[PDB]
């Protein structure tokens, strides 16, 4: 059975709860207080709470019939005009989440919350749909991440002059790894390189010395990336013959 | 008009909601379900929900008069002694958020939620106030960040001895980038440098070998930063003539 | 006195609130609106709100008696059968939080929220219990962290061949720092090294050149970690005599 609570103003409560937890109409809050049971081509939610569109309901021994040999996307369907039974579940061949705003308008909200894969006769795997918190600015003491943090990534290629090539990758507008390529020739120690300066978003607050290596040799150089974006050669003097330059150097922008 | 919901106990609910979402009195939750409309020196909020001091209300075709040629700071003002209209909006010359605790004592809460810039005749730009979630310890599976993560940063300058200087920058109490400055003279391979040891908070769990470069030359060195904070020279033997030492090296503390 | 609000469906509201804020039964939300006051071996909570098992209640001039010369773990205990006073406080010799599910079943929930250390006559220090937010997937504009972010860490040792050892540490499944160990001999420039290739999870999307240093010498080398996991020697030619190889180099996988 489906027990409905945030229903019949309920929409003002719905919006209130949505804003508190940071959810839009394309996600859910979900908790299996008890394990869902699979017998034959069925999923029985024994005790599962769901919040969808800010509306709280409970799935208490609620069984969904599954189609065999397929990926079943389990949906919660909220139709507020259906006074007695506003919430129903369905098993579908695709994620058909529709993001319909049931708190400000009319229509039926569909949200996928479970993915259940079957064989010919039973369930072989289940995967919950991600519960998304959409927040603005967070202040926190400690954080632990079990998967991954995704931060902004910018990339820039600089033809620094004299044949030298920098490939810069910046993450979190702060950490930069520089990869050296190309070949150096016709330059002296302390000379500014004759080509393109580093773009503003990659310029460090303080001068950075990045060490590189001459391919196939036991010799070394470094360049200085200056705050103004210019690059200063600080290897030895190089004559007319180009020498291949390689290596990773890293620096903080801030 | 302004529709009031968490109002008139309400203050117990107010505090409950504040604690659920992690807000204090100096922030809001805000959602424009519909776009605000500008007509000459006015902002009309067509359908905007706000939570301020844990109190939920709705701005439904609510117009705020604006002052010309200035930055207008739009405030929600909550006075619970005014039972018929506890919430009013104002446009002010500065952000005058007062953080007044209306759920525990008397007073009027003022919180800024919007910044609207005008010319002499109309609105030229609007900028929402940030919605802050103040949290303690978070456990998360995945995170995506569209702006930046700010982590703690510690800096240290070490006069390592023999003329060598290290400038260390530590972020997130883990990633360290070291910048070499100064000079080296009067040292042999495997000798610990004769100056200051690296402070406790910058010491790695295991020995870190950091490659440096001699400015204006094609030659190299490396130092070992030992778990105990001492620094071992592992370049060649250097006589009485000082050689300028440069380069970035990075290591993990944990 | 203890004022009980989410009490006497109340279990449905509790679960809803637990889901909104991302709490399980082994943590709390807690706010001292007013400072708790210590006198002799007692703590008076002057105005403290708590949420435990999604149940909101207030500690308003509520005194807990302490045991002398020890570490007192302050618990909120919730027994729903006790209609008139479902919440009580205890000071105990250990953290005895039991995670009992009072919203779906019977039993007494105990959650620790404070740690109070005493001398023979008085309180010497207090320390709150962390408030945990357990979240799934976060999308955020900006974050500021005052403590630390813990990200996944993977560790690998590669016996690269020719005597060379790579110790790789990968964090956030993206940033790798390689530490060189061992010695190199019997290798020519441009030759692939004769040992194990880098395991899949440490392979970069693009070729990475990592600069190394020869211990006790002024000479350098670099290696290329190729996308397929192979390692290419790009130092000079090395004969039968092993030379110790050291240094830190970093790269991004993505």
UniProtKB/Swiss-Prot annotation, chains A, B, C:
Ribonucleoprotein in keyword set: no
Keyword Transcription regulation annotated: no
Short name of one Pfam family: Caudo_bapla_RBP_neck
Gene Ontology biological-process entries: cell adhesion; entry receptor-mediated virion attachment to host cell; symbiont entry into host cell; virion attachment to host cell
Gene3D superfamilies: Phage fibre proteins, Phage tail base-plate Siphoviridae RBP, head domain
Compartments reported by the entry: Virion
UniProt GO cellular component terms: virus tail, baseplate
UniProt-listed InterPro entries: Adenovirus_pIV-like_att, Caudo_bapla_N, Caudo_bapla_RBP, Caudo_bapla_RBP_neck
Region ranges (Host receptor binding): 154-254
Keywords assigned by UniProt, alphabetized: Host-virus interaction, Viral attachment to host cell, Viral attachment to host entry receptor, Viral baseplate protein, Viral tail protein, Virion, Virus entry into host cell
Domain remark from Swiss-Prot or TrEMBL: The C-terminus is involved in host receptor binding. Host-recognition domains point upwards, towards the capsid.
Subunit structure comment from the entry: Homotrimer; found as an assembly of 6 homotrimers. Interacts with host phosphopolysaccharides; this allows the virus to bind the external cell wall layer. Interacts with the distal tail protein.
Job of this protein: Binds to the host phosphopolysaccharides at the onset of infection. Upon activation by calcium, the receptor binding proteins change their conformation, presenting their binding sites to the host, and a channel opens at the bottom of the baseplate for DNA ejection.
UniProt similarity note: Belongs to the skunalikevirus receptor binding protein family.
Protein's name in the database: Receptor binding protein
Gene: rbp
